[PDB]
Design a protein around this ligand. Structure first.
Ligand SMILES: OC[C@H]1O[C@@H](O[C@H]2[C@H](O)[C@@H](O)[C@H](O)O[C@@H]2CO)[C@H](O)[C@@H](O)[C@H]1O
Ligand SMILES: OC[C@H]1O[C@@H](O[C@H]2[C@H](O)[C@@H](O)[C@H](O)O[C@@H]2CO)[C@H](O)[C@@H](O)[C@H]1O
Lengths: 160, 160
């Protein structure tokens, strides 16, 4: 009876293939050592965190938009259009926990993803696409990330 | 099928009560923003991390001893003596390519606690005192702790 922990640094703009895969029952948390909710204007995304499947599809895209004051979730296929957007308003509100740092956890629930920011569940995203996560990525628009330039992802796998 | 993330700030010498007790299937991770592998000696423990009950049984005690150069895993009842110690030899070899921070993960697997330093499992530990983890502490000697002044503890609960 053995689960695993895996630890990745992700620079803004970079992707990472996962040493182990995230499937149902598993957890991935993105840790940022800074929080800039006065950061300015994304075009449109201040920061996006992404779970990507084997072929470069987005199972989950989490995008913080200060100037639109929303957090935007979505999925898509590789080279195909962005699917049905979901939104949660007030960005700065979901972060009242820690100043100067934050964490974003994605609980893979099989049919959904629970997304928790620090201690607060911000969406129970019903999946638009099924599949194993093999890749995580972090983007920003330069000069306006709400998060550090490096984000530490930790994965807890072997859970099921 | 909804999970909880709880975050806790533990200073050396302190104890914290979990708003969501840890049980079979659950996870604690302790995050040190420091790694001082030349801080010793301890008395004997440079650093200790503890998973307790409401009745205050040490369900899992993890002590780091630089001088004896060992990680001790033990448990004890409230106001009683320690049980059968388990010892892992060679402290810095448990932190291979750690750098200037560390994390320690405990999995509650029911029969055994699975302890992982960063990405390396260090022990599968046959429970000597059973049940759910209801509390956490961080103990250090003098200023000889191998971790940072404050450790951040993240619990993942409601997993199975
Ligand atoms: O859906 C996430 C996706 O949005 C793109 O921007 C959209 C915008 O959200 C939509 O309402 C607008 O009308 O058109 C834009 C282009 O699809 C982002 O550019 C993309 O990166 C994701 O963040
Ligand atoms: O065993 C957990 C507990 O150990 C104590 O030290 C032990 C020690 O490992 C053994 O060699 C010793 O001489 O008997 C001791 C029990 O008194 C530490 O004092 C303690 O803080 C814990 O880590």
């Amino acid at each position: 009876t053995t689960s695993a922990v895996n630890i990745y640094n992700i620079s803004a703009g970079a992707s990472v293939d996962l040493a182990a895969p995230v499937t149902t029952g598993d957890i991935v948390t993105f840790f940022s050592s800074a929080l800039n909710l006065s950061a300015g204007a994304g075009s449109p995304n201040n920061t996006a965190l992404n779970l990507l499947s084997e072929n470069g599809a987005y199972l989950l895209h989490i995008a913080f938009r200060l100037q639109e004051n929303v957090i935007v979730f979505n999925s898509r296929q590789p080279n195909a259009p962005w699917l049905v957007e979901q939104r949660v308003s007030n960005v700065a509100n979901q972060f009242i926990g820690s100043g100067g740092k934050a964490m974003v956890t994605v609980f893979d629930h099989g049919d959904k993803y629970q997304v928790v920011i620090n201690e607060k569940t911000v969406i129970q995203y019903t999946k638009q696409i099924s599949g194993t996560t093999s890749s995580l990525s972090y983007n920003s628009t330069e000069g306006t990330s709400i998060f550090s330039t490096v984000v530490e992802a930790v994965t807890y796998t072997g859970l099921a």
